[PDB]
């Protein structure tokens with residue numbers, strides 16, 4: 001069956017360039033164009049260009065001419081995309097696509113039935129940074145709320161558990177938000193009985209794999 | 223009475239036994255003689271739909287030409303995958319001859335005699351033939367060589383003009399010679415001469431024609447954006463040698479000086495990419511002595527820049543990389559139908 | 563070229579969603595569905611033709627330049643964002659989201675002062691939690707010594723809880739340590755459909 005194996009996402013700074021590969025399989029690679037499309041959250045999808053693997057003929061969208069390059073390796077059915085002179089506008093999820101109608105006699109390019117898993121590309125002048133984990137201590141119906149504030153980390157994602165996962169009831173971890181500094185920050189709260197603030201111990205396990213930082217932040221009443 | 227159908231066609235030609243040229247021999251082994259007195263019967267009050275982009279004749283011609291090259295243009299080594307199959311690499315006397323395509327019993331070819339017919343849609347001057355006109359299987363990119371000309375005006379052909387994925391074939395109504403030479407005594411460097419005035423007048427006419435299918439939008443030509451040399455350059459065959467020509471000067475937007483003789487840098491390659499499918503092929507070093515091919519430029523293969531949001535421009539670039547389109551540029555006016 | 567509407571569409575399971583797309587050109591129009599964090603899936607092409615694995619519930623129709631995609635009997639999986647396409651061009655997208663209906667539930671409101679540890683870094687974040695409420699619309703109003711705070715904060719909301727169908731919202735007001743130490747009374751005022759009157763949870767700095 002038709003499978004578009006894409007290379008993973010990556011982290012970039014403005015001015016650098018990026019390279020993405022997409023391995024085709026399950027069909028004759030020369031029969032039909034391969035397209036590249038980027039999707040930025042809250043923005044109109046952008047077709048970048050197609051490549052016809054036979055001669056490597058390309059058609060690049062006006063917007064990208066000069067900056068983009070599309071090549072392929074016929075001997076291994078792999079397609080390649082390079083995007084140069086990156087800015088923060090190039091932050092999107094880049095896909096490779098192939099239409100549905102694909103035979104040796106004819107094709108229709110634009111009914112994209114087959115997509116790659118995606119490759120999230122983020123372009124920011126922010127460097128990788130471990131998060132600072134600050135307590136949200138409770139005070140004094142009969143329930144108290146406490147939590148972790150996970151501030152100033154780059155990039156996504158960060159993971160939060162409570163009491164090493166032994167506490168999952170009444171837990172709300174919020175979608176992280178992008179501060180004007182460029183760093184991320186999220187809060188994770190949990191509701192507990194008031195008759196436990198002095199007995200049961202509450203620890204917020206924050207793990208941020210990119211910077212390789214783990215924090216076991218104990219939240220206790222001030 | 224009749225209905226559209228796909229059958230197995232047979233070929234006819236004027237190949238002679240005394241001619242030892244490769245394509246000629248191929249035709250003595252594969253074809254019957256050309257019908258001495260061809261009868262073309264006209265159909266009255268008949269309108270039929272043609273579709274050059276859906277025509278099995280193209281497929282058959284493709285298989286034939288693949289066979290022809292298989293027995294004539296035999297490369298020294300073929301690099302597949304994978305393996306590297308070596309073989310014999312003789313001198314090649316190759317010069318394409320007209321081949322007629324003919325229908326077996328029970329079938330018949332319908333032909334469109336409409337002058338400005340673009341290849342798809344209804345035709346109202348239909349006639350019946352038993353054979354196509356002579357068609358030289360000339361394999362080339364960007365430029366269509368030694369083909370037939372449009373009988374009236376320049377014609378733009380495309381499965382759908384707004385689909386940038388679709389090739390655009392420009393059919394000229396007046397040809398322009400291209401004179402390619404490789405001197406005697408670097409034995410790979412060659413050149414191609416074209417009369418600037420003629421070519422520019424023609425190009426002017428195709429831009430002014432293209433402008434009609436784009437609601438008075440400014441039309442701009444540009445060099446290819448990428449791809450193998452076979453497609454980024456004018457690629458063709460002459461005297462068994464494989465030529466590649468830089469066609470930048472051919473698509474100069476300003477020249478509409480620039481009216482003398484346009485001279486193109488060319489190169490003769492021994493390592494080429496096979497148009498048949500996947501794989502590179504190596505050929506023996508070029509023969510000695512002056513090599514010269516004079517061809518008629520009859521058509522142009524274009525590709526329109528997509529994503530052209532806004533603007534008052536439309537950009538076109540030469541080639542065009544699917545040889546089946548070379549065949550379509552000739553077979554556009556025919557379709558096979560079954561009787562009863 | 564392609565104008566797609568409406569921007570957003572909040573609907574309950576069972577209802578029918580009607581997304582529209584206006585063209586100015588012609589040729590095969592297609593609809594795609596993208597679920598949060600997954601690759602888009604072709605849903606319809608030629609304006610009216612379902613793709614493989616697409617059930618009868620999805621259907622498309624046409625009138626001149628106008629194209630509709632209609633999804634009847636909405637279910638959890640269907641929610642996400644939809645795109646129309648004509649050749650290389652796409653629409654702005656339409657976000658279709660799930661709101662399972664339930665009885666109105668007022669927010670539990672909690673306010674958290676900045677930790678000493680954070681203050682030591684020379685910055686201060688005041689956090690206000692609105693826990694388990696319905697419907698999703700709600701307003702948070704920051705006040706610093708009774709002064710209304712416009713543009714000094716950020717909100718974040720969870721998706722609708724799978725178990726109880728409620729929402730939770732977190733609002734964070736950030737300030738320089740000096741500004742934080744300039745004022746005394748930090749209040750969070752919440753208005754919602756379940757509250758007969760706005761609820762203000764608050765605290766005094768350094769107590």
Ligand SMILES: *[C@@H]1O[C@H](CO)[C@@H](O[C@@H]2O[C@H](CO)[C@@H](O[C@@H]3O[C@H](CO[C@H]4O[C@H](CO[C@H]5O[C@H](CO)[C@@H](O)[C@H](O)[C@@H]5O)[C@@H](O)[C@H](O)[C@@H]4O)[C@@H](O)[C@H](O[C@H]4O[C@H](CO)[C@@H](O)[C@H](O)[C@@H]4O)[C@@H]3O)[C@H](O)[C@H]2NC(C)=O)[C@H](O)[C@H]1NC(C)=O
Nearest residue numbers: 380381382383384385435586587588589590624625626627
């Ligand atoms: C690249 O491909 C595209 C198509 O993929 C080519 O675009 C079109 O080519 C043809 C030939 O010019 C024309 O196709 C049209 O198809 C219609 C049928 O579609 C169905 O849906 C219709 C929806 O409503 C449409 O028709 C009603 C009237 O019945 C109009 O009021 C309304 O505005 C819509 O146009 C159904 O109504 C219909 O039953 C079908 O089920 C035809 O309806 C349409 O008729 C055209 O001609 C009529 C006069 O004969 C005229 O009254 C209509 O308004 C309409 O123009 C037509 O056959 C399209 O004209 C054309 N594109 C456009 C302008 O839509 C494209 O040409 C090709 N590119 C190139 C360069 O070749």
Ligand SMILES: *[C@@H]1O[C@H](CO)[C@@H](O[C@@H]2O[C@H](CO)[C@@H](O[C@@H]3O[C@H](CO[C@H]4O[C@H](CO)[C@@H](O)[C@H](O)[C@@H]4O)[C@@H](O)[C@H](O[C@H]4O[C@H](CO)[C@@H](O)[C@H](O)[C@@H]4O)[C@@H]3O)[C@H](O)[C@H]2NC(C)=O)[C@H](O)[C@H]1NC(C)=O
Nearest residue numbers: 315316317318360367368458459460461514515516517518
């Ligand atoms: C587009 O279409 C045109 C024709 O319409 C093609 O042009 C032909 O090109 C072929 C190949 O280049 C030409 O074939 C050659 O003809 C020559 C004729 O020799 C003349 O002079 C000799 C004396 O030297 C006379 O005996 C003879 O009668 C002629 O007057 C040959 O020289 C060529 O080579 C021959 O000799 C060499 C010797 O080494 C051998 O290797 C060759 O095999 C061969 O025997 C050759 O035969 C042909 O003349 C052209 N036609 C015309 C009339 O112009 C284009 O090729 C075509 N373009 C493309 C891209 O397909």
Ligand SMILES: *[C@@H]1O[C@H](CO)[C@@H](O[C@@H]2O[C@H](CO)[C@@H](O[C@@H]3O[C@H](CO)[C@@H](O)[C@H](O)[C@@H]3O)[C@H](O)[C@H]2NC(C)=O)[C@H](O)[C@H]1NC(C)=O
Nearest residue numbers: 372373374375376377394395396426427428429430431432
């Ligand atoms: C080859 O084809 C081209 C068309 O692509 C021919 O050029 C065209 O010639 C016709 C007349 O034969 C021109 O039409 C005329 O224009 C004038 C000017 O307004 C008008 O008075 C006439 O009524 C008529 O409409 C047309 O402009 C011209 N097209 C272009 C693009 O220049 C050419 O004649 C053909 N050549 C051969 C050898 O047949």
Ligand SMILES: *[C@@H]1O[C@H](CO)[C@@H](O)[C@H](O)[C@H]1NC(C)=O
Nearest residue numbers: 340342343378380381382383
């Ligand atoms: C070709 O000409 C026919 C004439 O009816 C027209 O309908 C069709 O749109 C044309 N096709 C193209 C793409 O040139």
Ligand SMILES: *[C@@H]1O[C@H](CO)[C@@H](O)[C@H](O)[C@H]1NC(C)=O
Nearest residue numbers: 399400401402403415514516
């Ligand atoms: C082709 O070009 C060569 C080299 O310039 C020239 O000698 C010859 O006369 C030309 N042939 C024609 C037909 O113009």
Ligand SMILES: *[C@@H]1O[C@H](CO)[C@@H](O)[C@H](O)[C@H]1NC(C)=O
Nearest residue numbers: 417418419420421481482483
């Ligand atoms: C070039 O082409 C024109 C076409 O009108 C012709 O008249 C002229 O003689 C040619 N000139 C040259 C440089 O050979």
Ligand SMILES: *[C@@H]1O[C@H](CO)[C@@H](O)[C@H](O)[C@H]1NC(C)=O
Nearest residue numbers: 445454455468469470471487
């Ligand atoms: C063609 O010519 C231009 C200028 O003559 C040159 O810059 C270019 O590299 C040449 N080759 C190709 C393949 O464009």
Ligand SMILES: *[C@@H]1O[C@H](CO)[C@@H](O)[C@H](O)[C@H]1NC(C)=O
Nearest residue numbers: 580623624625628629630631
């Ligand atoms: C759905 O599309 C049809 C066809 O254009 C349109 O008439 C109708 O108004 C659309 N649906 C709604 C609810 O507007």
